[PDB]
Amino acid sequence: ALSDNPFDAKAWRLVDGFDDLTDITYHRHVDDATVRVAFNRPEVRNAFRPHTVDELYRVLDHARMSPDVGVVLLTGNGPSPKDGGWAFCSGGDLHILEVQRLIRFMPKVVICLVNGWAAGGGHSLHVVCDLTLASREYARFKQTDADVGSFDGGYGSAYLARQVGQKFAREIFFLGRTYTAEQMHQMGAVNAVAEHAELETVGLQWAAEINAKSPQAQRMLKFAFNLLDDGLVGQQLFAGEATRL
Amino acid sequence: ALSDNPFDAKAWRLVDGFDDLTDITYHRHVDDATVRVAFNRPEVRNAFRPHTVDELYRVLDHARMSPDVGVVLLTGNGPSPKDGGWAFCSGGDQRHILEVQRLIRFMPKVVICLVNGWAAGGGHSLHVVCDLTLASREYARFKQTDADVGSFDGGYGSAYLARQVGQKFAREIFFLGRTYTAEQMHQMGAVNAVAEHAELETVGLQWAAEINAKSPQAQRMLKFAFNLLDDGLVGQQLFAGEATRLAYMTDEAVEGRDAFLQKRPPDWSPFPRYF
Amino acid sequence: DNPFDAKAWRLVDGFDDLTDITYHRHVDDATVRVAFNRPEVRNAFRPHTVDELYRVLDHARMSPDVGVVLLTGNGPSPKDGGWAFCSGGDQARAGRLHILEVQRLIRFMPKVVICLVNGWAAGGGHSLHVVCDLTLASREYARFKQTDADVGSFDGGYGSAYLARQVGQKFAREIFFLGRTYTAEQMHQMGAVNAVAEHAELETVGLQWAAEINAKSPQAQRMLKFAFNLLDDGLVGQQLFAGEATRLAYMTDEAVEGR
Amino acid sequence: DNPFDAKAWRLVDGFDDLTDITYHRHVDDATVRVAFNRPEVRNAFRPHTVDELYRVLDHARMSPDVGVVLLTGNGPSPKDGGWAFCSGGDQARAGRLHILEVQRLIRFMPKVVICLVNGWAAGGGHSLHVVCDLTLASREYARFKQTDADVGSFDGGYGSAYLARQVGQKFAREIFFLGRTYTAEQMHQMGAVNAVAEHAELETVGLQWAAEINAKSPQAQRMLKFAFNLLDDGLVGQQLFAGEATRLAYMTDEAVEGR
Amino acid sequence: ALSDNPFDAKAWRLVDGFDDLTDITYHRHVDDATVRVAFNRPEVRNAFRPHTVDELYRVLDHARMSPDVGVVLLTGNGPSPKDGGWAFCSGGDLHILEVQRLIRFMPKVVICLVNGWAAGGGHSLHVVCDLTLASREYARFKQTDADVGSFDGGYGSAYLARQVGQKFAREIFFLGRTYTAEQMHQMGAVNAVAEHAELETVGLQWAAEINAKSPQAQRMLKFAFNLLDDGLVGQQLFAGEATRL
Amino acid sequence: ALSDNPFDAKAWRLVDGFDDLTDITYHRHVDDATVRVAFNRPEVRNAFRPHTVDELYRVLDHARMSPDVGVVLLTGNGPSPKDGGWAFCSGGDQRHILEVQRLIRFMPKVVICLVNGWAAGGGHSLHVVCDLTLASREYARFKQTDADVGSFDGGYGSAYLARQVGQKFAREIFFLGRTYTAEQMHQMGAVNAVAEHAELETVGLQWAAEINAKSPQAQRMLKFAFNLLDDGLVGQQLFAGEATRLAYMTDEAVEGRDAFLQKRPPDWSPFPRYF
Numbered sequence A, E: 001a002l003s004d005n006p007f008d009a010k011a012w013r014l015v016d017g018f019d020d021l022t023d024i025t026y027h028r029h030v031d032d033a034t035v036r037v038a039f040n041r042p043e044v045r046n047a048f049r050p051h052t053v054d055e056l057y058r059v060l061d062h063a064r065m066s067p068d069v070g071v072v073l074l075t076g077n078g079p080s081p082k083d084g085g086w087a088f089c090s091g092g093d094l095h096i097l098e099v100q101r102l103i104r105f106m107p108k109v110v111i112c113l114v115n116g117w118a119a120g121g122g123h124s125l126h127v128v129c130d131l132t133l134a135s136r137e138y139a140r141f142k143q144t145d146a147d148v149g150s151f152d153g154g155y156g157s158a159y160l161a162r163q164v165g166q167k168f169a170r171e172i173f174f175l176g177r178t179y180t181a182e183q184m185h186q187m188g189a190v191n192a193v194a195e196h197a198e199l200e201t202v203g204l205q206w207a208a209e210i211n212a213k214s215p216q217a218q219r220m221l222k223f224a225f226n227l228l229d230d231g232l233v234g235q236q237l238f239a240g241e242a243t244r245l
Numbered sequence B, F: 001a002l003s004d005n006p007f008d009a010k011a012w013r014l015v016d017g018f019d020d021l022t023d024i025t026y027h028r029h030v031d032d033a034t035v036r037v038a039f040n041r042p043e044v045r046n047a048f049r050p051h052t053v054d055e056l057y058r059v060l061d062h063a064r065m066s067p068d069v070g071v072v073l074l075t076g077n078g079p080s081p082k083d084g085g086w087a088f089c090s091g092g093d094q095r096h097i098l099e100v101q102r103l104i105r106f107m108p109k110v111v112i113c114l115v116n117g118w119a120a121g122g123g124h125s126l127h128v129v130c131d132l133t134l135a136s137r138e139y140a141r142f143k144q145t146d147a148d149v150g151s152f153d154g155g156y157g158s159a160y161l162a163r164q165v166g167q168k169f170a171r172e173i174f175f176l177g178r179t180y181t182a183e184q185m186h187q188m189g190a191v192n193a194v195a196e197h198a199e200l201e202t203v204g205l206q207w208a209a210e211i212n213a214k215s216p217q218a219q220r221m222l223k224f225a226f227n228l229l230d231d232g233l234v235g236q237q238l239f240a241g242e243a244t245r246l247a248y249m250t251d252e253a254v255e256g257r258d259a260f261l262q263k264r265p266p267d268w269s270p271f272p273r274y275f
Numbered sequence C, D: 001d002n003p004f005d006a007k008a009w010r011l012v013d014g015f016d017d018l019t020d021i022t023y024h025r026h027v028d029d030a031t032v033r034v035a036f037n038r039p040e041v042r043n044a045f046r047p048h049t050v051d052e053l054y055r056v057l058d059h060a061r062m063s064p065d066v067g068v069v070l071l072t073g074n075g076p077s078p079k080d081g082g083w084a085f086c087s088g089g090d091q092a093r094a095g096r097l098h099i100l101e102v103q104r105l106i107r108f109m110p111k112v113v114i115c116l117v118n119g120w121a122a123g124g125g126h127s128l129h130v131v132c133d134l135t136l137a138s139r140e141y142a143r144f145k146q147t148d149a150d151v152g153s154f155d156g157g158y159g160s161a162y163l164a165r166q167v168g169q170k171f172a173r174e175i176f177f178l179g180r181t182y183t184a185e186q187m188h189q190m191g192a193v194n195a196v197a198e199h200a201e202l203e204t205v206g207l208q209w210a211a212e213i214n215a216k217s218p219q220a221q222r223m224l225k226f227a228f229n230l231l232d233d234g235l236v237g238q239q240l241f242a243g244e245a246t247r248l249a250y251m252t253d254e255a256v257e258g259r
């Protein structure tokens, strides 16, 4: 059922200048100052390959420089045409770290909409976003890192502790278990759980409430929150805004 | 309505020397080492004007220097005469507070915020900086309205909120500016406990009694231990300050202070280098 | 009825002289069991207990084949059937802050330390639980209580500040200021207890958790623990984490040719 | 021969009752002079001295037309002609860590505080110099000596840790551990003294520095001080700096319409 | 005298793909794994305009992604054809902050060669570089910020304190005085003073010594030093390298 | 050559219980509360092998637990029999040290490094982590050779160096791996003072005597105050640890510990909440 898909086609318009995208879709809301950036490889659980990261960075960088956009919804398209499964981003198949810093530093609120599996790099992308809304039925959080020799020792991990605390964060990474939206909400990494079909609708509601406030204030607030854990980099961004005033 | 008001008149006595207060009430408990500091402008949702801050600072400063007070209950009087509505503090009066925040943060006493109603804008930030928070189940309303008024508390009000509810929730609270109940705020970690409106202060007094029953000193050291790392050098200065005080009252310190007056060498012989 | 299954453990060779602590090595998995062995006094620790505890944990730290340490308390008390993980300190270099050294040992060892709260966890005992990487607690008997201030004492380090990094500033301050008693479930809700388990299954679940941890890359787990510590341990945390990066670079090619 | 030029200063109205501290406002510039006034005892401070010092500095902090505070010591001593900025503390709420409050006042006021070391700067006096934003010292008479440990006391806050942020860990540890006496030049080489000046010119140079500071944007100077503090003052530093950003946003358009 | 110019023409080759640069010059050393990035607007004291920043970022980004380059020499061309004066970068005429983060985060050592005036934004660029060598005769350091309402409250200022200490750093910014290479070396912001004509020669010597060591080790070391003051961002970069090993 | 050796044999006595040391020498001063710990492999530029680290840790651990020792002098014996060259420590033996670093960092005693010769690689990092450093004018040679051997000390050896000489110099020292003299290192801020080779230990003993003449406790508190903020929670734990010890010996603590045994209420009445 197309009506059961999180994507509300009539609410979006393709952003001009990105017809060449193959691994990522990029839309601009018809009314609100909100864009939709999504992984477009459902056939492979929205895993990202070097080319996917290139497009992801280019898209987010453009949203960052769009004066009329105050909120970015980051999600994954689906379901998989191959097995009907759902995925936000299952991780690896420039670098993905650069994408994380882009989300972290852009003066806009980035809301991650976990519509399905969020594993490995995909999970870390969710953690670094400012807010997260997850599908009650299909969101699945699993930190894949420890199993393979790799691991995300920065925002991916350390920053997770700043959301769910040291005990839970260590648990999530050390055992690599799979968690639902509700469990992750209880721990503090998911702001709210929503019905799958409503995931983006709720996301749009959240973005509308955010855009209704002072853009300047929202910008200052984000860097005030970052300033904490980002040391001199955080101070530079916040101070940079101060000087702008 | 009297018995249903959070305020228990028989448990408090006005603090001498503050009859001139107009925007704040200041009471001392009849038995315990606990005071009650409350916003006294229910008609305007306990919003604060410059004069309110002046009194608030003066009152808290006095509580800070009261050797016999170990706990401060910060709340708001009510209900509102105009509409019978309740409020702890609706923030600035749309007609300095940061100094008040530091006062609550640095005083060597536990400050418990009793959210009896709306806690918005500056009022919400005051709750966040307090050491503990108890909230009225029926009327507590938390709302960070800074952003839609073009303002923002980029320090204790916000950053420090993340140290209580985590980065995701804290950003949510500030970015959307939604209204939350005592129970929701308790689930997120910013409210220690929910209490029935009429019992808010009774429970607060219970909490204050349990705190005052322990070693004053220990409590004081503990507060600065908790403050220490988010407050950097300032936190170290306060904690270390408590440390130099403890050292001053030791035999080794007695010696060395005595050896100085007698123009004679100190004798550290009696004191082992503990490891 | 008892959490301890004698069939899954073997005494560790060389520690037959222990009196206040028991030390076992799992029959199959790379997991050890370190437990307070003074149930008669609610597993409170005296200087001798700390000496043995440090010696045991230090040995586990240096055991190349051990990836997980289960820290718990034996019981019940023969006197009254009660249960306790550790009730804290037993009420002239006799002023050695030795328990602090134990905390740092748990904090710095390149292995995951899971605390299994089978009963009362008070004072120093409570702080030991807080510093461990993970905590599983007995639904029926786990009791958390920070009693320090009552006696005029206080753990102003990992016992308190670090608790705030698990349950947040409001809850941590509450736990210490009022010194109330909490259940496994309440502590789980606040964020200091990873999971609640039925008393009799406490160690079984612990072994399950340890097996899942040991099934992954030892190297990765080690790096991850220091990544998490790096956050609050400043230069010390950086030293431990950097130390591991160095560990890797030693087995490298740039590192081989040029050397 | 004396650094103090009576012609450049006017007493601040309202402080005629001061006994241990002098407080002047410059005849032209937005600069005040706050000085210890107990030369007979090497400008050591007693509880009363701290009370006045706090009151004076608090007033300077709230003076909208003052951008720079010169903190020094009057002299010489009528007893022996010696010179001193401040020799520290004069050797039941009588146990008030009031001098610490003075430090925080200097640290938090939105004005540049320049310490003018005209003589001995020992113990608490030395720590006061360290916490100031800038320091100018008398070539001939400035003497820096951290004496705390001799008496078994110690400033484990801005007096010591913050010194390391100026001269580095090695030198800071040296200064405190040995408690040796240093000249203005030596302290300048290590990084704790901005510039050395001839004794008689000390305040003249100080006024020059204050004039150059006052000639710039008051707003910018204020933001800059908190930017530098933000580094070591954690949340407190963030609060002060963020507080200033808020100050700006209040006079803004988004801030006006919507409001 | 062309021989008295810091630039040693025979030691450099233009990097392919950058003929369109107008405000910046970009060369690759004939032998060593070192590049030369320089402000090319001597007529205006090498001040930067938005276009200059765009080119600067593009050039540095390319150097960052060049596997065979281990060191970046950042300087300013001169002298001014108009007055014969010298300048590295006199400051403002994407954002310059992004350029700072690029220098800060690239896994290569960036050496700033102050051949003349380093003021305002120009001064802040020097501070954020890993190492600094300055012309004895013409280097002039002046923090312009406080005078105009602007100020660089991040790396520009805070980070300066991590090099010269809090007293000197506050002095430099509060009074905005002009300092020589030697004075700045005494305070700790300049690694070494060199004769004007030898500035780049010495820089090349320093870069050769740096390139002679393990690239991997140098990379780890830079992030170890950054990790300090960069909070989670620093941890992410360092951890990112760890995982690469 | 005897009188010109930094080592003054008449000032030291072997520490009992360490005759089996082969790579390290360990002496106790005849009068002062000072010990001497030195690398004893001059033939190989005092490079350390696993066995050397084992002994070094054991020796320092013992000094740490010696109630009568307030200062540790860490140096290297010499000259080399092979070529008469001098060295404090050339680092690892190209044939755990981090634990030794933490031991020096955490012991409640001042550790002064006496660089009598080459201080390279691990040897250089050991000097950086010591509280103070004195260096031989004629033979001290500092060189961070980590990078050209494909290795690196990414913690105390490097990051902590920046807290002594600043970020620019620290990066220079590590990135280029150049050799520096005592005087150059003193100018940058990593060497407290330069001394004539033959007087290196004499000056070190002078420094140690001045340190031991003050309050042991104060010195101990000061060291942890300095360590406190770069060491995060670990630093707080050590400093706070010293704080809980001081509190334990107070009347208020006596009470509350006594009230507990007598199964009777504590009485905090006598103790004011200091502010």
Ligand SMILES: O=S(=O)(O)CCCN1CCN(CCO)CC1
Residues within 6 Å of the ligand: A161, A162, A163, A164, A165, A186, A187, A188, B162, B163, B164, B165, B166, B167, B187, B188, B189, C164, C165, C166, C167, C168, C169, C190, C191
């Ligand atoms: O201490 S930190 O600020 O780093 C992280 C806060 C600890 N908390 C984690 C999870 N809850 C969030 C609500 O479940 C509260 C506090």
Ligand SMILES: O=S(=O)(O)CCCN1CCN(CCO)CC1
Residues within 6 Å of the ligand: D164, D165, D166, D167, D168, D169, D190, D191, E161, E162, E163, E164, E165, E186, E187, E188, F162, F163, F164, F165, F166, F167, F187, F188, F189
């Ligand atoms: O304390 S910090 O690590 O932030 C900065 C170091 C302080 N120093 C500044 C300048 N000198 C460098 C040599 O002039 C030594 C230490």
